[PDB]
Amino acid sequence: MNIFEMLRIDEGLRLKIYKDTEGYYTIGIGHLLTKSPSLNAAKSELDKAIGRNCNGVITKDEAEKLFNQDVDAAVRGILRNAKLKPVYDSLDAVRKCALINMVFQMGETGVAGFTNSLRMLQQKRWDEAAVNLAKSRWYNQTPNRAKRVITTFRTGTWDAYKNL
Ligand SMILES: [Cl-]
Ligand SMILES: [Cl-]
């Protein structure tokens, strides 16, 4: 498994504008278009991102291009972040994916706020970090996805994504 497969599973793929779990306009593989409630604004942001008049729909290749851009942006965001970088550099390959996943869903900002969990992960206190990560709105609002990511940080394996 790799980060692309992992996020593909957690975010799915939709080729028409849709509302994400928080009601925000999104498309493709979890690519957020805007937080505004206006559908026009979203169609606007869509065309600007794609570079053509899409009228709210894109192709699979367009979706995959956004996804490649988004994963690259997240990793780079992590590396530019002073709170994130040290944790990311301390982790093994599987676990790094769980961090990227969080960053892709909630942004650099959002993750850098899980201060206590981040320190636990840095110290490799897996079971403790998992408990701490669960005391969050994130786990309470999207528990199935949060459980998969948390199990990933806990075990360092892909078991939570296996058989999906
Ligand atoms: Cl809580
Ligand atoms: Cl969920």
Side-chain angles (χ1 to χ4, degrees):
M1 281 249 355
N2 59 58
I3 188 57
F4 289 96
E5 291 170 350
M6 191 207 199
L7 275 163
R8 169 74 165 77
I9 279 157
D10 285 330
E11 299 286 356
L13 162 70
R14 308 205 39 199
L15 302 179
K16 28 82 244 299
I17 293 181
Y18 66 95
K19 283 200 211 181
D20 74 353
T21 179
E22 297 256 79
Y24 302 135
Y25 287 124
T26 301
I27 197 163
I29 291 121
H31 181 86
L32 184 280
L33 292 158
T34 179
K35 299 215 256 170
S36 128
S38 168
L39 182 61
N40 291 309
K43 265 153 136 131
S44 191
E45 286 300 313
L46 178 64
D47 285 356
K48 173 160 70 73
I50 303 300
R52 85 190 165 62
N53 275 61
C54 297
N55 201 27
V57 41
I58 58 172
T59 76
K60 189 178 101 323
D61 314 284
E62 289 173 333
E64 282 161 347
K65 101 147 329 159
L66 287 179
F67 190 31
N68 283 149
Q69 290 171 175
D70 291 336
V71 171
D72 181 63
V75 175
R76 266 157 8 184
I78 277 165
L79 304 163
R80 300 186 246 99
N81 194 292
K83 291 80 115 236
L84 306 168
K85 179 175 204 278
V87 175
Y88 185 79
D89 284 343
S90 70
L91 302 168
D92 54 276
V94 180
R95 286 178 179 96
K96 278 183 156 83
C97 286
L99 187 61
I100 295 164
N101 196 304
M102 289 181 79
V103 173
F104 186 99
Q105 181 183 6
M106 57 198 87
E108 181 170 334
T109 25
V111 184
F114 277 70
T115 284
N116 302 318
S117 295
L118 296 174
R119 321 167 358 242
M120 275 163 202
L121 287 166
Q122 206 157 344
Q123 292 176 86
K124 317 202 173 289
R125 297 143 142 256
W126 318 125
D127 281 59
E128 296 98 313
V131 168
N132 189 264
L133 285 157
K135 304 195 296 171
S136 59
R137 175 194 196 258
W138 169 61
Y139 176 91
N140 281 103
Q141 303 287 141
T142 53
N144 291 138
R145 187 193 178 148
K147 287 181 193 121
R148 292 192 284 279
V149 171
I150 288 164
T151 290
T152 299
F153 273 128
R154 198 172 12 98
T155 67
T157 66
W158 290 109
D159 302 337
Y161 284 88
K162 234 219 100 195
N163 239 196
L164 284 185

